[PDB]
Structure formats: C-alpha cells, structure tokens
Amino acid sequence: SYTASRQHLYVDKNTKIICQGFTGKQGTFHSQQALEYGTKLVGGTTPGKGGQTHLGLPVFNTVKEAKEQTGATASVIYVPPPFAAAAINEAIEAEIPLVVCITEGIPQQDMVRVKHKLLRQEKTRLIGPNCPGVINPGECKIGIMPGHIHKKGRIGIVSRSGTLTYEAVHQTTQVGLGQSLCVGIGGDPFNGTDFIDCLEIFLNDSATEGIILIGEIGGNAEENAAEFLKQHNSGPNSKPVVSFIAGLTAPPGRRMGHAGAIIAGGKGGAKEKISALQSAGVVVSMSPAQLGTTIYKEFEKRKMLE
Amino acid sequence: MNLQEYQSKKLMSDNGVRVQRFFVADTANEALEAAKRLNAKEIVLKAQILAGGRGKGVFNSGLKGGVHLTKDPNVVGQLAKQMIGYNLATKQTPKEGVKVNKVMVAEALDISRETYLAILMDRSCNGPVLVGSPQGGVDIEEVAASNPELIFKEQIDIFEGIKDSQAQRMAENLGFVGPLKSQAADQITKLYNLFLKIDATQVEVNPFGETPEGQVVCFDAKINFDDNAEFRQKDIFAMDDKSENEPIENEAAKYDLKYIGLDGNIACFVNGAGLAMATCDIIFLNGGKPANFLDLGGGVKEAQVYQAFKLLTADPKVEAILVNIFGGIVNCAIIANGITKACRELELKVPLVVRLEGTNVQEAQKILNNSGLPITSAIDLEDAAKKAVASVA
Ligand SMILES: CC(C)(COP(=O)(O)OP(=O)(O)OC[C@H]1O[C@@H](n2cnc3c(N)ncnc32)[C@H](O)[C@@H]1OP(=O)(O)O)[C@@H](O)C(=O)NCCC(=O)NCCSC(=O)[C@H](O)[C@@H](O)C(=O)O
Secondary structure: OHHHHHHHHOOOOOOOEEEEOOOOHHHHHHHHHHHHHOOOEEEEEOOOOOOOEEOOEEEEOOHHHHHHHHOOOEEEEOOOHHHHHHHHHHHHHOOOOEEEEOOOOOOHHHHHHHHHHHHOOOOOEEEOOOOOEEEEOOOEEEEOOOHHHOOEEEEEEEEOOHHHHHHHHHHHHHOOOOEEEEEEOOOOOOOOOOHHHHHHHHHHOOOOOEEEEEEEOOOOHHHHHHHHHHHHOOOOOOOOEEEEEEOOOOOOOOOOOOOOOOOEOOEOOHHHHHHHHHHOOOEEOOOHHHHHHHHHHHHHHOOOOO | OOOOHHHHHHHHHOOOOOOOOEEEEOOHHHHHHHHHHHOOOOEEEEEOOOOOOHHHOEEOOOOEOOEEEEOOHHHHHHHHHOOOOOEEEOOOOOOOOEEOOOEEEEEOOOOOEEEEEEEEEEOOOOEEEEEEEOOOOOOHHHHHHHOHHHOEEEEOOOOOOOOHHHHHHHHHHOOOOOHHHHHHHHHHHHHHHHHHHOOEEEEEEEEEEEOOOOOEEEOOEEEEEOHHHHHHOHHHHHOOOOOOOOHHHHHHHHOOOEEEEOOOOEEEEEOOHHHHHHHHHHHHHOOOOEOEEEEOOOOOOHHHHHHHHHHHOOOOOOOEEEEEEEEEEEEHHHHHHHHHHHHHHOOOOOOEEEEEEEEOHHHHHHHHHOOOOOEEEEOOHHHHHHHHHHOOO
16 A cells, blocks of 8 residues: 555665756755755756756656666655646656655645545655655755754654744754654645654654654644554553644634645644644643753653763 | 625536526616516525625615515615615624625525535545535534534545435435435536536535425535635636735735734734744744734745735734744845845834844844844744733733
8 A cells, every 4th residue: 555655755865866847946946955965866857858957967858767867766846836746646657766746836636636646556655745845864855944954863753834843953953852854744735645654654763762743723634643643652662752733823714824724614723633642642832932842851751861 | 715606606507506596786777677587486685795694784875684585676676776886784794894886686495405515625535525414504513513423424536526326325315305316416416526627625505405396406605715726717716806805915915925814913924834823823822912824935035024014014903023034045134134124114113023043143133133123033932922922012
C-alpha cells in the first residue's frame, strides 16, 4: 500500500534532487539558494526546454528523461497551480521516490484526483502541496526553509505550517536540542503526507528521541494522530511528544489563509484537537513561544539530558 | 465568494436540478410582468440580499418583510416598488441595511416533506461524499447531536463517478418512496455532477423535498466554492457579490492578501498563515483582543507589508499593531526601513510592535528605534504579545 513509501520522507546525504519548474522565477531562486547551500540538485524539468542549461545544470523535457539521466531520487515542484497536479502525476508515473510540491493554490478537486492515483501505488511519496518541504539538517534540504537555523539533533518535527516550524526549530536549537528530521506537510486539505505518516518514521528512528507536532484548525488529522499515538506510543519505549495547535481564536466558517484551515459545519476547532492530543499523552504548549522549553522539560523528566 | 439566491438557483437549474420557477426583476414594472408570466396559483416575492432574516426585515421605505406571498400580480408590482432601490435591514445586517437592486418573483411551492442533502469532499476518505438526513429543514449539526443515527453517508470514487446504486440508496435513506425515490436519485446525480463541474467545496440542499403534487424539488440551497479554482471558474466568480463583505476584506483581496476581521483592537500580520493564526492566539493568551488575521504569505515582499499597513491604518477599531516577519535571506534592515517608510507615508497613529528574525536584526531594531515614530521591537513572540497588550488603554 501507499504507506510503504513513508520511508522516502527520510531524505539524507545521498538524495539527488530535480526541480520541476526549474527555469521559472521561484524554481530559479530556490535552486540558486540550494546550489549556494551545497544541495545535490542535479537538474530540472520545463516542458519544451529539454537540452537547455540552467544554473550550470541540465534541463529536461520530462521527469522520466531527467530521472534516467541523473539518477534523481527526489523532485521539488515550483509549477503554477493550473499545471501542478499534472506535474505531480508525472513524477508519480516516473516513480520518483519522493516528490515535494511547494505550489499554493492547486484546486482541491485536482488534489482529490492526485490522491486517487497516489493511494494506488507505492513507489512515490508526496509531501504537499502548499508546503515548505523537508530537511535532514546537515544532510539534505528540499524546499524553501532557511537551513542555517537548523542543527542536527534529537527532535522530529511535523507541521502544517512553515512559520511555526521555524519557531520550533529556533527554540529547540537555542536550548541545545536540535532536529533529526523536519517535515512540512503543508496547509492544504488534500495532500500526500499526514501526521501519522511522519509519526511512524519518528517512532522507529533511533535518532529521533522526541517529537513536536504542529497543527491548526481544519480536518481531523490531529485527532487521527492522537489515536495513532494511543495505540503505538503509550507503552514501553515511548517518546515524548509536544504540540501546538493554531487557531484558538479563529472564527467559524472562514479559511484562515491556508485552504485547509477552516472550522466547517462545527468541525475542525482547535480545542477538540488539543484535548484529543492531551488524552494521547501529548504535552500541548498553549503558547507558540514555548515549544522548545516544553520539550526540553519533557527530556529533563525522562533524564534524557547531559 | 457568495451568490444571491437567484444566482445559485439559476446555476442549479442550468445543470438540470429542479428548483422553483422564477424570474428576476430590477424594477417594479418588471416584477409585475414577471408575475404575470408565471401564471402560478401563488407567487412569492423575495428581496435579493445575502444576509439572513429577510422574512422579518424592514425596508427604509417603511415596508415590513422581505418575502411576500400573493396571488395577484398587481400586488407583486406594488410591493416591489417599495423594495427596489431601498435598503433592507435584518437581524443579520448592519442597522443601515443592504440596498436591494433585484427581487425574485417565483412560483410559491408547498413542501410536503423536507430532507437534508449535501455533497462535499471527505477529508478522511479522499473523495466526494453524499451526506443526507430524512430530518430536513434544521441545522444538520443539530441532527448530528440529537440523532446521529439519522445521518447517512455515501462515499463516491472520483474517477468512477456516482453510481445509480449509491443515488438510489441515499434517496431511500432520505425517506423518498416510489417514483419519488427515482426522482430524488436522479436529482442527487445531477447535484453530484454540478458539484464537480463548478469546483464547489460544498453543495448543500436544505430542504431537499417533495411538493404535494409529486415533484422532488431543491427548495433552497447554499453553494460554497473553492477559491483555488477561480482561474477556471471566471464566470461564476464574476457573479461574486462583494457589497456585504467588510470593506477592508474587499480591499485586501485586491492585493492577494488574506484578511479576516475579528472583534478586537490589536491588529496583527505575519508572513505565513500558521504563525498569522498563532499571533492572533498569543495576543489573546496574554490578555488582548486581536482585531484581525492577516497572512502575507510565505516569503518577504516589501510591497505586501506596505499594503498591510494601508489596510490597518484605515480601521478605526485598531489601537495597536503587532507585526511578525521572518526575513529569510532579505536583510532585516531593508525590511525595517520599509516599515518606517510605510508608517511615515501612511501616517501611523497607533503603537506598533515589531518582531523580526533573520539577518541584521540589531541594525533593524536600531532603525525602528531612531525613526521618531511610535514603534518598539520585540525579542520573541511572547514579548511581542505582552508589549502589544500593554500598549492599549
Ligand atoms: C512558485 C509558484 C508555484 C510558481 O510561481 P513562479 O515561479 O513565479 O512562476 P513562473 O511562471 O515564473 O514559473 C513556472 C514555471 O513552470 C513551468 N512549468 C509549467 N508546467 C510545467 C510542468 N508540468 N513541469 C515543469 N515545469 C512546468 C513554466 O513553463 C514556468 O517556467 P518558464 O517560465 O517557462 O521558464 C507559485 O504559483 C506559487 O505557488 N507560489 C507560492 C508558493 C508558496 O508560498 N507555497 C507555500 C510554501 S509553505 C509557506 O509559505 C508556509 O509554510 C506557510 O504556509 C506558513 O504556514 O507559514
């Protein structure tokens, strides 16, 4: 099943990346940043520009050709909303192991169709859309996050929001803890990776000693994660989990920036997510400013420091 | 976006959904002529505004009631004369009411039975779902509380499309019998295809019901749309009635900013939706009332910061502003100089608290402090919230 591809989330120092939308404005900017950073970006696609050169790297007409010629194992998508679902499907059909879709604004119906294909295969793992990407600090960064605030360490972070991840990352570097793997699953309602997908990886990763789960209003993914944690993180060798849930002050029936951030028909409020997570053993930080201190204290209680 | 009743009912009718016969009129004489064309036993005249409570509303002509029944077309013309061009006030409008430019003149239909039927994408099953209840005419959230056993669902595969077996099963669980069951199944099918065609996030029919004469009719409905599909729904989004939106929200939309007004006096904005929500929250946690949510989107665009100030300096409820910006690769001194520029040119009159993270923060904070403007810097989000709360009296 599609769950078999969860492992592809754990990018590392061998991950080779192609950029779909490579010659576009944001594809160019973030590829320029990635190359300055030392990332193993090896090429990119723009239909019709195969055989061109860009940032010293080859451009390809198709993901299939790019994959065959470069051995790429991941792709990152900076393709505009009308065509980005097609770009995701192209990567799935080319069996790229990990696809990271940055694009904001893909029609929800388009993503329901993409998910249909995604769920019926297991070669390709999709993160996104409307997400900032994934980083294994010091080994591989795919997406738009600032690498410098990260430090390789002990905390796995999964988040529906990049700005809140940056808070969590800064706070956990300041107190000396660091990050094992950070996954931004993005703000859209229909996407390729949920909290459980990441929790599975974190709970089985020896490098991950604690977890930060960052959520918000909308949907039921946080509640599903709570049930997963009751089943798989409630006995021996459990790991501390800290969470913050955005949207306590959100009014009902309004999309709070993110397409997926809406309290609809009385469902999706923050209070219910906080309570569900608390019942699964999660320490919910009421303030977004206290994620690092909250997880630090949980390490202290378990005698996990110095 | 929102559609007037006549707009959503025409959209449904154009796609094979059965709704009441009606015409739209923008003058009393046109309402008169429309009433005669219906040749109906009973006619309903309805003022077209988005806000609820039209039935108990009052026009500033003095006429009571935005919905009137009559058998006489001449009465339709007379009452329309005291609606069109006047403002209709209801419990859900400002006391000034809403200008009525159009009225619906429709055949009044009796409702023998009421049910609930909605179509949306199921966020747990990845695919459309039909949600229905034989308990129609009420808040579906109330049926789920009182009687969760009266809520029925059919999960649909987006590539297979709706199947007759699914439509018939839902029609039966909604309480339709005999030929009316077959009619309801057909209407469910047409509603499903409509839902996909228009990139709705939800098509909700309440009541979905029957007339004494033996017809299944969508008596009233609410359609919510996917804003992400506007680029392929130009004609529907051109119908968007913005006249009842908060003006600041309409202005923010012109510049691709997502503003949501709240009941408070500490405004804020952030370059990222999650932290934009959490900044509203942390203002509350520290004893304040956030005035708005405002997401600039990820990344740094000085022009969006400028437009954000232009929006907020216009709101008289705003007594303080909290800005949180992560500069990424952009030197924060450039951002800081942009902030002071905006606050000078737009004449900032309220205390501003700024939280910046990125490169060159020390210089940026010095720029803000030497500006001669009511601007203070914060060292983290909690400090920012406490400073913002403490700046209002
Ligand atoms: C960046 C894009 C996709 C494209 O804009 P541009 O690059 O300008 O767009 P172009 O137009 O300059 O460049 C697009 C290029 O693509 C090429 N092409 C088209 N089809 C394909 C195809 N099938 N395969 C490959 N390439 C193709 C096209 O020819 C062109 O190339 P060419 O011109 O022909 O050479 C934007 O649409 C967007 O989506 N922008 C917002 C991104 C965003 O913000 N995402 C959320 C991040 S997360 C976050 O913000 C926080 O987490 C937050 O949520 C929180 O909570 O804090």
